[PDB]
Design a protein around this ligand. Structure first.
Ligand SMILES: Nc1ncnc2c1ncn2[C@@H]1O[C@H](COP(=O)(O)OP(=O)(O)O)[C@@H](O)[C@H]1O
Ligand SMILES: Nc1ncnc2c1ncn2[C@@H]1O[C@H](COP(=O)(O)OP(=O)(O)O)[C@@H](O)[C@H]1O
Ligand SMILES: Nc1ncnc2c1ncn2[C@@H]1O[C@H](COP(=O)(O)OP(=O)(O)O)[C@@H](O)[C@H]1O
Ligand SMILES: Nc1ncnc2c1ncn2[C@@H]1O[C@H](COP(=O)(O)OP(=O)(O)O)[C@@H](O)[C@H]1O
Lengths: 408, 408, 408, 408
């Protein structure tokens, strides 16, 4: 769909993800390839398949984020499944086809909500005419000067102008309606009333299929958790099973959905792993083949942490400022304040368990717990979160490890 | 259906698969027999059953390809199922009948897609008459001169010709429509309706049944993994269970589809295994009888690799060239550049895990990750992939084994 | 139904099965008894139940074949279930009622296809009148000389005569139709069009029930696999369970099908076993009672093998000749050629695993693999498969045991 | 319903079951009580519940027979369930409610069949009027003389009488029909329609509920196999679980049928066990309370065998005679011939495994396998089965034990 060059894709991705440039280019080549395909002939369009990617890296460093923004950047249906979610099907459990179903039920919850945007003006334009007709019951067979029904547009224009907020005046209009009612109702009762007429069925739902088949993006988290490990055997065939079960989906097949027959042949798959226990070559042959692209993501550094705090669009720090504004409070982060927030986050991750950038949300959130509460009773103030503030609120917590496993 | 002699079939298969002539001949006789049967009399048409084949050979050497191209050659419904899938039905699992159901659901998504083909022309040749009849409302009672109609075929033709591109001009036409939607859209909405009213829904779905029963092709992958092994016993019963469960399908029976009742008596089965652990004689006797054909496929040599790289139709090397051209880049592989790509792929397979030809895809992709990204910014250029380039991009990675298990 | 004497039944069975005369008479007494029952009074018709048989013998010696031809000989609904198919239901798995359902879904797929025979002339007789009426639009209210609408039968007879192959002349006829179309379509569109009128519902489907209840034949393969063995206990109750589960079906009960309520009280059951591990007396008491008839089948001999090769109707050898004819090739088997085919088959079965007559299909098929391929390029020739040919093509294979487990 | 005194019930049971008088008396009081209850007042009709019985005795000695004849004597719905069936529900299994569902589905297949009885006369007495009204189209306005109609009862009677056999003469009659189908068929089609329009569908299915609730008879076989044993523990909980699950059914509750809501409060339960391993006092206490009646059934003696062979109604010996007569053969058993048949049956039971009276069926069948086949070719003859014949056909087999475990 999008005509963005890889380089432009990576750029656009740099607005939400710090670092991890390689994974960015990998995911960017993939998207651009979908464009590259449509520019080919009949034969070669069937033959050319998605270049599925296998992202390799430690927790919370941007794997899913990259895949989510990539998806969002191409207004593509996106689904994220955890691979072990099927390791129990040997006893019972969701079938893998569910992936394509969900990638469909959300590929719908998408075309639906996005059919409310396109149809949010129609009910308030060529449909607000409902009340205006009961405000000034049109002439007995309008004449015909294509400006005659635009003429009032004096008596008329006055009713539409006064309808800029003034209502609650009960009337009635038209299974059409007829029923007598208000306007904080007849008007809204009109919103949906005239909107279901513009949107049809066998195209809306027929399109979700079109999307999924053409722009679907499946993200299989922890694919490494379904590889074989030298600890047992019974659980391995269980794992290797999910691999075989996943095989049809990435090799090309047909799945049944209560919306129609979906074809996976062109769904893009981004698998994800840590590969500390297993290695990508432990994946079954058929799967390694369908996972041509391999890209690693590095662990995050304190500097990456500082940058993640403020650089992205709608960064946690930015959001925070916004939210405190809601309370009429002006929050401000000095460079050293942020340098310390990141510092703390790094400390806890190093002293206890490493959870990557996630740690910033809990640290940031604890740090602010006080302002968040008092925010309403501080209205009209300029609060500055500087290094001092940061230290007074986090030091004790970070310093105390056992407490860190609970509170941070 | 096809009237191709076995020899002609093998030829047409030679266009996609390198070597493996014995397996080609085997799969060829099978097809030719479906014809041979329809040439017999009433009685003999029930007696003569498919000559199911059991392909024996190492991973990624052409077994599935041969079968998929065989089916795609006879426009036959094709399903590939991993036998071990049903090993878990013992605790709960996809029924084996599912194989014939899915064979049907894709045999539907097939006859249905190939339906949009013939109804994509007349679908929009009688669809024009619609938009035209509202740009030149026909006279009150056409004058039966079977040319008095083709009169505008003056005024008329002007719109048809001016409708060869210049459109997107709001209109109104006809549960028919009656609405006043743009021409760009009337046209679109029209594609549907005229196409639909042109499709016999009953005979449609009844045809998929006809296909499955007549030209169905089931490929049971890794059947050798459901044979008995001297490692345990509990699994052997479940393993052998899947054979007993599969037994009715290849012996002849009736399964219930949500599209009708299908009979498996003439579906062609191509079973596949590596048979390193078990031997074909380990299959239950009822099954060995239904797999009269045994053909081995040899492992691929580096020479096979070089050829698989450029020789087939839409070979991966050709595909890359096509894709890069979409970007305006002329890509060319020198004989030695290709000799070296195959060389590398063989190396990782001998060095690490042998995944057959699948390995060329990952090497080839890693080799081009650079060009693929820069493509757009390299427009109008003649990039040449020779031995130098190849060695500069793969050698280090290939030489580093542990890295190979991750990146190649 | 059939009024055939046992002796006549056995005769008719001798046309497909070599030897196994005892099992033939056993199965013959059973069929004749169903006739014997209908010739009795009210009371005795309820009381007299089928004399279910337990066939005892080694693999592939004619057990199922005998039961299939018996079934076919009486145009009776037939189903073949593998007994262990239910040993896993303790964890999950098909319920035994499925037997009666499938014996119904196929007792339908039967009455349906056999309703297409009876109705294959009606659409091409009292229904081909469709086109003939648009070829010569009948008079405005035909007169009435019962030979007046037989009069044309000059203009008329000329249209029906020219309709012996000449079509593709588009017309139109009549939710009737009306729609304009061709004749390689309007004519076929008429085939089914006028056929669904003759066949009704509540009799067609109502009859399948009637068949199953009256002439149903259930073949429980490997009943011996669900008997108790002195190796464990947990799996025995699992086995003994299938026995208890099967009990209602052969003792007399009601099962629910999406076609109606079926009564098993008169379904004939032919159980089958090898009984090498267990003995029929290991079956539970209630089951031994319902399995009154016991008959053994002997292992096959080389001579039996030679006879099976050529004697039965549509024997593999005969079929082969037929199929090669399709290619315009004349195949011929000399006595010694066949003596050797059987010989080889016996050798492999004795040197590796014995699979009875099955072995002949794989041997025969390997032997011919070459002619089968070249058949098209040999058109108009007289190929003789004699002892020499046989030996040149099979010796090496049979002689090599490990190879025999793969290729033969 | 039945107004039979217990003593009269036992008498009527004596017609099918030899001995086991105590069990007959026990099952007799139970029936008589259902009457005794309906004779009480409002209150006491809720209080008085069935007096469920627990039959204790070796296999094949008359337990199930007694219960089936008891039910068939009261035209009551009867279901026999093997208790151990639900032992596997622990991992997955038929719900115990299924017992009351199936009781209903056969209680339907019952009231529905017994519906075709009363609608098999008037079904084809008003069905004639149809075919007659088209062979003697009634006058325009019959002349109200309630005999002016029975006038042809001249012309009319001629067709009715000539319709006592001579038919199969194409006609036409009337969604009614209107079609022109043969008389043989109009007649057939007529059987249906007139029968159907004569059946109150609502009251039909509502009656099955009435039966199950009022005269239902559940026979829970081998309940002793769900009592606790000092062999394990895990199975005891599941074993005991089935008792707890069965508990609501015999204590009084409501189950959901796909034909309505059924209440078990008055279903009569006859439990059955061998109780060699467990003792009735091992049933859970809540269950022992619901099984107030305990009756033992003695093992069968050879004298019992001789009597079971000829004494009952439609005894197996009588049945054979009937069946052979269908072939025109007069079969006769001499007193000593029968004494010897029983003798053999007792012998195999003492020699091998004791399967009770069930053993007479297999011996009797093996003994007649010869006559049964030759029957037709023996027409018009007086074959006599005496001691000589018997000994000549059974002795060798009986004496050979291992052979007995297979053939008898
Ligand atoms: N490189 C990064 N740039 C921006 N945010 C990041 C980065 N890495 C992690 N995060 C933040 O941390 C959370 C971790 O999830 P995610 O990014 O999906 O990675 P993973 O899939 O490895 O757990 C996300 O909500 C994201 O906002
Ligand atoms: N002989 C061959 N000729 C052409 N391509 C091959 C050959 N062998 C393998 N391949 C390529 O490698 C992949 C391996 O899959 P496949 O051919 O199905 O074999 P297998 O069933 O053994 O895995 C295929 O996509 C195919 O394009
Ligand atoms: N006695 C026989 N006469 C003819 N064909 C036989 C005979 N025994 C086996 N066969 C052939 O071998 C195959 C083995 O299956 P079947 O006859 O059902 O026996 P089983 O049930 O013991 O395996 C059949 O397809 C049949 O054509
Ligand atoms: N006392 C008896 N009188 C008549 N027939 C009997 C008797 N005992 C057993 N039988 C015959 O043997 C078979 C055994 O089954 P059944 O009578 O149900 O007893 P059980 O429930 O102990 O197995 C029945 O079909 C029946 O015809």
């Amino acid at each position: 769909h999008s005509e963005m060059t890889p380089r432009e894709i990576v750029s656009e991705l740099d607005k939400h993800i710090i670092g991890q440039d390689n994974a960015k280019r990998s995911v960017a080549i993939a998207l651009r390839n979908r464009w590259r395909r449509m520019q080919l002939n009949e034969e070669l369009r069937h033959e050319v398949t998605p270049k599925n990617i296998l992202m390799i890296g430690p927790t919370g460093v941007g794997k899913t984020e990259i895949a989510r923004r990539l998806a969002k950047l191409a207004n593509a249906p996106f689904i994220k499944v955890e691979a072990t979610k099927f390791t129990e099907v040997g006893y019972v459990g969701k079938e893998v086809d569910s992936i394509i179903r969900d990638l469909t039920d959300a590929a719908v919850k998408m075309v639906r909500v996005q059919a409310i945007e396109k149809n949010r003006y129609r009910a308030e334009e060529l449909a607000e005419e409902r009340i205006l007709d009961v405000l000034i019951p049109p002439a007995k067979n309008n004449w015909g000067q294509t400006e005659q029904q635009q003429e009032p547009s004096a008596a008329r224009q006055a009713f539409r102008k006064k309808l800029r907020e003034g209502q609650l005046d009960d009337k009635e209009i038209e299974k059409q309606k007829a029923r007598k009612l208000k306007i904080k109702d007849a008007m809204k009762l009109l919103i949906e009333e005239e909107a279901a007429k513009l949107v049809n069925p066998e195209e809306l739902k027929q399109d979700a299929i079109d999307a999924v088949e053409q722009h679907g993006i499946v993200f299989i988290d922890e694919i490494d958790k379904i590889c074989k490990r030298g600890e047992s055997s019974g659980p391995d065939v269980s794992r290797e099973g999910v691999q075989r079960d996943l095989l049809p989906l990435v090799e090309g097949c047909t799945v049944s959905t209560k919306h129609g027959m979906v074809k996976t042949d062109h769904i893009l798959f981004i698998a994800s792993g840590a590969f500390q226990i297993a290695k990508p070559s432990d994946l079954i042959p058929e799967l390694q083949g369908r996972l041509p692209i391999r890209v690693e993501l590095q662990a995050l550094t304190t500097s990456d942490f500082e940058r993640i705090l403020t650089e992205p669009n709608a960064s946690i720090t930015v959001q925070y400022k916004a939210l405190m504004a809601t309370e009429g409070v002006n929050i401000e982060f000095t460079d050293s304040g942020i340098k310390r927030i990141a510092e703390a986050a790094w400390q806890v991750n190093e002293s206890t368990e490493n959870i990557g950038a996630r740690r910033l949300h809990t640290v940031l959130e604890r740090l602010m717990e006080e302002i968040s509460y008092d925010a309403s009773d501080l209205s009209g103030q300029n609060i500055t979160i500087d290094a001092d503030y940061v230290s007074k609120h986090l030091d004790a917590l970070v310093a105390d490890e056992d407490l860190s496993r609970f509170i941070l």
